[PDB]
Amino acid sequence: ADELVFFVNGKKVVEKNADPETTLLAYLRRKLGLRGTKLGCGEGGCGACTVMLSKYDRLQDKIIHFSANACLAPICTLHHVAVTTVEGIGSTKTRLHPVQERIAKSHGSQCGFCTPGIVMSMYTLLRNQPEPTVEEIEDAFQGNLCRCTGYRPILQGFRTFAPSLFNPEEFMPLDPTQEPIFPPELLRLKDVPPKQLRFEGERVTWIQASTLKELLDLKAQHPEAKLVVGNTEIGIEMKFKNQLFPMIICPAWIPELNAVEHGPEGISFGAACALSSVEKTLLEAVAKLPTQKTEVFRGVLEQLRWFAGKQVKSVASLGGNIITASPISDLNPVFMASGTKLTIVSRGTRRTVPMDHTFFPSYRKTLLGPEEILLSIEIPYSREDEFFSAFKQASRREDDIAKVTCGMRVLFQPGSMQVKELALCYGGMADRTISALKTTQKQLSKFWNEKLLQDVCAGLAEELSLSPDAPGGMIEFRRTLTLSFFFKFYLTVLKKLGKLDPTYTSATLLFQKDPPANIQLFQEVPNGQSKEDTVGRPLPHLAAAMQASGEAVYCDDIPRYENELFLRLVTSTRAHAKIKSIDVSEAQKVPGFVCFLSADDIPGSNETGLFNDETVFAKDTVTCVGHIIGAVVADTPEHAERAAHVVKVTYEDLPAIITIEDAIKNNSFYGSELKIEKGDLKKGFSEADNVVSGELYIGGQDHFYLETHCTIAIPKGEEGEMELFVSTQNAMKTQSFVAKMLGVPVNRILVRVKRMGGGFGGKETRSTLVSVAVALAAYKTGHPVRCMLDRNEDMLITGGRHPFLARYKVGFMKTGTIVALEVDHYSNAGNSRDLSHSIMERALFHMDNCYKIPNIRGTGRLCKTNLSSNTAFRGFGGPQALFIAENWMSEVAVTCGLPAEEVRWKNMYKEGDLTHFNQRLEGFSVPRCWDECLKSSQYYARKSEVDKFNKENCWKKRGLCIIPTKFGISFTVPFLNQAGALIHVYTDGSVLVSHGGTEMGQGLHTKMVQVASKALKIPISKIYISETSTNTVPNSSPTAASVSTDIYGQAVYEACQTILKRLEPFKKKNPDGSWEDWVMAAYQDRVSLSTTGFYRTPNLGYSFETNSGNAFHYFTYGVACSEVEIDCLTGDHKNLRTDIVMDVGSSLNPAIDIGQVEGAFVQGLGLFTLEELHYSPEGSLHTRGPSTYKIPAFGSIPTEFRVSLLRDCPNKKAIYASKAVGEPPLFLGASVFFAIKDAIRAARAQHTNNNTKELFRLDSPATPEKIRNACVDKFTTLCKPWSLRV
Amino acid sequence: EMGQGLHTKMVQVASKALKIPISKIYISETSTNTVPNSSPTAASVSTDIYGQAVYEACQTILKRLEPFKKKNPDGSWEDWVMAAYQDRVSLSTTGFYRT
Amino acid sequence: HFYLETHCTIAIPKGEEGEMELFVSTQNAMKTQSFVAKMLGVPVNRILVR
Amino acid sequence: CDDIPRYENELFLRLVTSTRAHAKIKSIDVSEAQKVPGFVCFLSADDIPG
Ligand SMILES: Cc1cc2nc3c(=O)[nH]c(=O)nc-3n(C[C@H](O)[C@H](O)[C@H](O)COP(=O)(O)OP(=O)(O)OC[C@H]3O[C@@H](n4cnc5c(N)ncnc54)[C@H](O)[C@@H]3O)c2cc1C
Ligand SMILES: Nc1nc2c(c(=O)[nH]1)N[C@H]1C(S)=C(S)[C@@H](COP(=O)(O)O)O[C@H]1N2
Ligand SMILES: O=C(O)c1ccccc1O
Ligand code: MOS
Ligand code: MOS
Ligand code: FES
Ligand code: FES
Ligand SMILES: [Ca+2]
Fold this sequence. Notes:
part of a larger assembly; 4 chains; alpha+beta; Ubiquitin-like (UB roll); DNA polymerase, domain 1; Uridine Diphospho-n-acetylenolpyruvylglucosamine Reductase, domain 2; eight-stranded mixed sheet; five-stranded mixed sheet; 29% helix; binds flavin-adenine dinucleotide; binds the ligand Nc1nc2c(c(=O)[nH]1)N[C@H]1C(S)=C(S)[C@@H](COP(=O)(O)O)O[C@H]1N2; binds 2-hydroxybenzoic acid; binds dioxothiomolybdenum(VI) ion; Xanthine dehydrogenase/oxidase (chain B)
């Protein structure tokens, strides 16, 4: 093998034994020790692994810079390429780069795991355009996801490159002259002609071909050899589909495969040209050539706008997309509809054919022979009388897989409306790209008119049929899209042939962004407050700079010991079955295999889980797909994964219960019914003028913390001692569960948590699934062992939010006043209890939202099913119950024919009222939040503008909704409301604070340092918090229920008071001395400078049996108004504007609190409108990665996004008058859901029927499928019994 | 610990003070983030001074557990400890001594 | 002295805020901590000696 | 201490000490040291940050 030579951050790397299977991400992290680049998914959709690549382009005679996903970039494609990672642009140890400084100071980093990738996407943009436009800045992040921030701060801080939370005037200006130079050595090497290279790995041989002749000789000798250019398809096939291609040929260096030629018929691109290059060339052509010649080009560009992100488009080749031949390719339908010419060659042969329906004969195949390669593609200029359109509709606009995608072309006889040629090609409607030939052939010679529209729609409905078992489901929606896209094409062509009814015009408009507008309002601190007292000030997260530089250490970033091994979980592939046998004979053959662990290897107990109803490793039976059966330990992660894949388990299926309906039918529940009942329901229903009954469903949610679960376990070899580094919110339970499994006392186990790259409740208990397995491996082998879950394992195994089904009945007066309410809740709990009971209790505690209901009955049942156990997720049952409440409230308004805001206001609690669980509402600020939100959002004025828009538009509608929320603060299990701290003041006066809480991005340590600095009256610079550990603060409650600031704040405060009391005698003797003087005097006088602090929330204890006692210490409140615009023909929608007013008492840190409000709101927006998990009828999760599970993207947030923290609202019940903010704002994301529902009502009034009191059901999430299907019209109708009783 | 058996003696002291077997007590290591500003282990006084500091920390634990012992006199150390935890009483304390 | 185990130290730099964790054969973790902090020019609270 | 496993990237230090009871250090030449396989660096007073 030849040496692979490339550069990383300006340093030369010579790899003498490059393995073709090694990705750049693995190489950076495991060989170069550069851990700033992260693994977030391994499938190209999160951007956490983003790096910049720079090379000398021989064809352009210039150095080019572009971004790429290190998780998919083979190092074997990087010969003579210069890589720049986050570490290469700046650091806190030298100096931060402006991109790093701004994202940190703008509050654009919370947990920090996505920060390096976003920093690199932004950095790459600036290296290409030092003064980008706002649009270029937003587009730079099509391929980057953040789960914490809600995106607003990242964009607002970066907008600077185009009281207040940050000051742009302080920012260091960008100076391009100070950027690292391209490696001089690489610039010299450019003067040496390319030579063919060969790399040999453990399983694969890679040939880098330098010339076209070499490529053709290689393909003639090895027809099976797999070509790889960008690796964005092959990398997925290798990693996720268990494919192994022993020989790969990379033809990327070949001039002919990279040539661009402008011919008389069109523009030709070599097959290796990156999509970003195609995009640039076509944009240039569209700007220079007449509109009539660029119809096809604009179609290609419209698809490229929504094709992955910058990282993928910069490496993905044209040839790769065409030859991969995926049924959902967004480009093949366009190339097929336009008859794009393909030049195909093999040694000694060359032919050119226009792409047509025959080019794709069957699933993933094309008409190329085994020895042939695609050389170039010529995209045609459009002719006179020829028009083209391309459309794509997915689950999320940005970086998503098409549900239906198409290319449509029509050629008319000269100057007429008479069809000469017509081509309608679709992706997503079959196992290959297809053309609706039967349908289009019938229109040849017909004229473009209403009858043609009807005939084509009827034809498409018949020809593009979908059987009920079609892969991907969404049968009705997909068929509706095929007709809807044709309708858009039809109207667009009429416009181009030309007037369209003005109310129809917007149906022809391509998606357009409106400029962003963001405002944050909060309260300034008192005039006389000391500059060193930072409580109330917008201090950035203390680790934000290190997060932006890639220096912040997350679990897997901790270096491995030389003898450290890797663990891979072996999980069930059946929902419910007996395990008959396990065969490890094949796994034992994989190189580096160490051992297979199972239940029999456990030295202590195999009984685990919060309620002791789970196994550590399955014994005799598996009860869900993903149920952990055992684990393989090996010398490398790849070897452990390969060995685990071949462990063969033989099963015998048992009857399974998957759904809530299955559980109810089978009486499959955990425990008995939970219930809260107040008043007289029968009397209430008798009094009611109206009564509405219904059923509602809300789907689950995957946490999608950017850092998945991970544990490192270090066995000491003495007395059973073990030290573990874990990404968990619950070190205490990690510690006791590990000790229980090992059969040793809890005092032998040390758990340390530095920080988590997100938790969101998902790491409150389920992190032990991994911790305990890794601990067993360390115990059995005597070696350190680690495991970080891949995203697909994480989504499958670890549980998520509980789906809820509700059956309700509400009685109300004609005025809208509620007089009775019954709601029966059912949650899908999965295969163990875990936190399901407490979650249902919190759901019952919030079924009132902010409304007084005199007679009310709510019940709850936990469904026991053969699915992974669901758990805590930000909101913990509250969002589900609050959603159900707002759904019936929205129906009361509709039924009464009254404005929704009036009906909500008149039902709202008042100061001093009692809730349905009889707790008094003291300091009830919803009314102020409501009136202020109505005013600042200009709700009334906009309501009329929305109505006007709906009158003027037939196929687009707007919706507006304002909703309130209240969230009870405290753990509903009394004993968890306790908190400890430990503080030491060293002899130099520096202070080390330790407390029971953990940092997961919410800024808890930052707030505790702010609190300690105010209490001690010393600068925050003298205080430090390093980590959370069980040997500093024991028996800690999980960092949850949004109360960490409240309780650890008090514990830290109390520890500081003790320190002050001890120092007082020294301060009195030397009043003019310094803190350092007093500390040293205390030390010399032998006064201890170490103390604990503790806090117990008072007066808590509610009983469901007596419906009495305080469930919560106080409530956090807020109101949100959101406006949306839906596309009635596709299901897509824009979040136009959202205004939030939140009561967080006297904020300890308005930057962090506004960040929590925005982040929580966006996660709620995701829950209610974008995020959906799909499972087979047998209980197997289909959606296991960002490609199929769509969380909010940069482009998903409200365009105008305003957040205000309520002024003059101190909360006497918590530290420094503040209020909990973690979870309360999430439900406000439902304001988007109800604005969408309002818009759908307008669309139904327009095309469905005139029943203005109709109550149509809309379950959550309101995805494009649900939105489109609810917009009933002539198209949904197109996509019988012998007798009917009269 | 440098071989002189200081941790052994401290476990013996803590066991006598708490009136529980030494098997329930453990000392893993010495660290600056658990006990700060320590004098060097020297002058032959470690047993004397850390013995007192350990003794005092044990007294504080006993005082916190006393209400639970009085409520359930026939219970076990484990019962009292869990009752204290469930009642949100801290089971962590410092101890200190000055000759 | 002829202690059978001679002097020994392992120093682990964390890469964050000057933090360092040291495993040391010493009777004086306090002075080890402050002397390391003094040489590095960082506050004593950044140094952990075990 | 030395029984604690080494990290995969853990390096080793060897002190360079005076061979004279009392003298001026005129110069230090590490050119031969730099040739030893595995050499990473020579550290001296000017490398101290604090
Ligand atoms: C996060 C993500 C998002 C994506 N988004 C989209 C999307 O929105 N729409 C869409 O359609 N696709 C999408 N893709 C798919 C993928 O990026 C494209 O199919 C890409 O264009 C393939 O190019 P490549 O160079 O990376 O292919 P590779 O993976 O390198 O090769 C792909 C296949 O093409 C063959 N091949 C390559 N070049 C030639 C040639 N010259 N002659 C003959 N055979 C050849 C290879 O042998 C292999 O079978 C996405 C992928 C990821 C990872
Ligand atoms: N950035 C970030 N913010 C977050 C989370 C997170 O994992 N990352 N977890 C949320 C959840 S589920 C909770 S309960 C609270 C917990 O922290 P707190 O009690 O300090 O507010 O933070 C919320 N905000
Ligand atoms: O929110 C709660 O009420 C709660 C109760 C018990 C455990 C975890 C929790 O979040
Ligand atoms: O209470 Mo959060 O960890 S769901
Ligand atoms: O006092 Mo002993 O350490 S000489
Ligand atoms: S880890 Fe590479 S895109 Fe997510
Ligand atoms: S700050 Fe972006 S994922 Fe946490
Ligand atoms: Ca559960």
